[PDB]
Each structure stands twice: as C-alpha cells, then as structure tokens.
C-alpha cells in the first residue's frame, strides 16, 4: 500500500516568467523545491535570493555571495523572459482556434476546441438573456492546447420559445449564435 | 498567487531518486510547449507550429538536470532524509468533442494532484487493455508543486464499447478505474 511504497526524494527547479500589459510589465521568479517544499527563490522584484523555509538559508546565502551567478540571474529577466516573449509573440500569442458551438437536449451548449482561454458563453430565451437556471462547467483544459466549456440551461419549454447560445471569443469578430427549438 | 496576463515556465525542471528519473519542459499559460527526451537527447515540441518555427538546445536541459541531481543529494542530507509523501490523485474522464456515434472522437483522462511524479495511466475497453490510439502529456506543473498528467484515447463512439481510465499511483489504496460511456 501507500505506506510501503518505494522511497523517493524529489527535486524541482522552476524558472518562471510573469507578463502583464504586453511587454510593459515583466517579472521572473525562480523556485527551488525539495519534494513539494519551495525552500529558496529569486524574485526579480526583490533582486536577491531569499530563503523560503529553514532549508534555504545555506543556499540563499551562498548564491547571493557569487557575484557572477547573482548578475546572471538578474539578467535572466532579459536573456530568458523578455527574449522568449518575443518568440511567443510570433507563435503562441497568435494562435487562434475558433470554438465549435453545439446545442443538445436540461439544455447543454457545448463550446469545444478553442484557444486562447478567454470566452463568454450566454443563454438567451427569445433574445432575452437568461439570469437563472444556467450552470457552467469550469474552463476545461484539454492539454492539447485547446479548451472546452459546457453551459447548461434549466428550462420549461413553452411553445414558440427560441433558445440561443451566444459565444464570444477573440478568434471571432462576430459572436457565434446557435438556435434551438423544441 | 501572482496575477499576470501570461505565466510561463522556461524551466520546469524535475529530478527524483526513484529510477532515477528526470523531466525538462517549457510551459506557457498552462500548456506544454515541449519536453526534452533525456534518453534520445532531443527536444520534442507539442505543436506543429512550434516544431516548425522554434528551437531549443537539448544540452541546456541535460546540463540543468545534472545540477538538480547535485542539489538533491545535498538537500536530502540537510533535511535528514525527509522523503516525499504520497498525495492521493484524482481522476476525471471526458470526451474532447460532443459524442455522435460513428464520428471520430477522443477520450481524455485527467490525472490531477500527482505526487510524487510517478504514475501509470492506461485505458480499458469493455474491460480489456487497449494501447492503440493512446498517448499522453508529460507531467504538467502546479503551483502547489504537485503535478497533473493527461492521457488520450482516440476512439470511434459505438454502442458496443464502454471505457475505463485505469490509474496506478503509490498514494492510492487500490488502482483507480474511472468509467465513461457513450
């Protein structure tokens, strides 16, 4: 069982970049993790290595004392974060996949295979937005660079009523509107 | 924790004593751009677009991992050999697109809260193993430093088949079988 599983010691190093407002704001944080414990880190906003837990003092002290290493780390905001952002700008940041909108019988509007993440899916009854009986799933990450989201509508079909699912996404200049009648 | 328009990991580095084994990959806004096969010493991009326009020196990954190994052994001692604690993983199965009998689809198996990063994810059809059309992502990072991984099974919806995503992990009391039907 879990108590007699093989012993494992795990190490993780995460070099992360944070981008806001295009290239206006850039921040990096490198994380040194033992098992699941982040014990030391470098935050470009702080400018020096800092111990996060009792395991980090020896590391943060030693690394801040290495002039070249310290300068190299501070310089990664440029050699890594800024440098790679330009590369994202010509590939990832331009990736656009239009959502496929489908409605099936209470009523489920399936918005599948889209990218980026930003989307707005709403239900309308006779061109009037539904404010209740609407439940959406969280944004679903497929792992293959596409997302999915399902929004259901609890309704009592009365004759003549026309239900529509409105979907807005950056890959679309015009909202996608799908109708459904009983 | 940190809010930003975009978050990237230009260095999800992993190394663990069990095996031993390691992993090197880059992620942007939660998805994997690539991973470096440490055996074949090659970079494997996850999108045709990337494979076509960008490149990464596998050696940087290999060199980084040797450093994580050096760091791990030292922290293992500084922590008096505190070993990783197994987390209980959670499994979820869903289709990539709406299910219409006869039309090609893909079953997705999300295995979340994985730790340590060692796991077996396999598929079952009508109770028996299936390897044809199966694939999976690398271990994707999480801010709490556990991981998640997604497996895929390309299939053709039919009334003659029911599936199961089987997950084996040291943290479980028994193998997990998450069922899914057309």
């Amino acid at each position: 069982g879990s108590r007699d599983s093989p012993e494992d010691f795990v190490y993780q190093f995460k070099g992360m970049c944070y981008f806001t407002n295009g290239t206006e704001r850039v921040r990096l944080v490198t994380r040194y993790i033992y098992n699941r414990e982040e014990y030391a880190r470098f935050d470009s906003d702080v400018g020096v290595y800092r111990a996060v837990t009792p395991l980090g003092p020896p590391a943060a002290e030693y690394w801040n004392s290495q002039k070249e290493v310290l300068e190299r780390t501070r310089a990664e905001l440029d050699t890594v974060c800024r440098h790679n952002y330009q590369l994202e700008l010509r590939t990832t940041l331009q990736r656009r996949v239009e959502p496929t909108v489908t409605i099936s019988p209470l009523l489920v509007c399936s918005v599948t295979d889209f990218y980026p993440a930003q989307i707005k899916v709403r239900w309308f009854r006779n061109d009037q937005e539904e404010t209740t009986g609407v439940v959406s799933t969280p944004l679903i990450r497929n792992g293959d660079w596409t997302f999915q989201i399902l929004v259901m509508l609890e309704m009592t079909p009365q004759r003549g009523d026309v239900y529509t699912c409105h979907v807005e996404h950056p890959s679309l200049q015009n909202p996608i509107i799908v109708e459904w009648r009983a | 924790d940190i809010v930003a328009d975009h978050v990237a990991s230009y260095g999800v580095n992993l190394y663990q004593s069990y095996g031993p084994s390691g992993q090197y990959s880059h992620e942007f806004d939660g998805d994997e751009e690539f991973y470096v096969d440490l055996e074949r010493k090659e970079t494997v991009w996850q999108l045709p677009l990337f494979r076509r326009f960008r490149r990464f020196d596998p050696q940087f990954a290999l060199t980084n991992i040797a450093v994580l190994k050096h760091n791990l052994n030292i922290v293992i001692k500084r922590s008096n050999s505190t070993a990783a604690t197994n987390e209980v993983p959670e499994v979820t199965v869903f289709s990539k697109s709406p299910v219409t009998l006869g039309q090609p689809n893909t079953l997705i198996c999300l295995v979340d809260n994985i730790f340590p990063p060692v796991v077996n994810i396999t598929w079952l059809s009508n109770g028996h193993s299936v390897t044809e059309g199966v694939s999976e992502t690398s271990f994707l990072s999480k801010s709490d430093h556990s991981f998640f991984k997604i497996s895929y099974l390309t299939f053709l919806p039919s009334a003659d088949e029911i599936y199961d995503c089987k997950v084996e992990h040291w943290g479980l009391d028994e193998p997990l079988l998450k069922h899914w039907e057309p």
Binding site: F13, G15, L28, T30, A59, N84 | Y10, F56, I74
Partner: peptide, 13 residues
Amino acid sequence: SGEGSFQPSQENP
C-alpha cells in the same frame, strides 16, 4: 533563434 532557459544555481556541499 534559440529558446532561453533559466539556469539553476548549485548547492554548496
């Protein structure tokens, strides 16, 4: 152009 990569600092034994 080559992709950038964060380089890990080395622990002192």
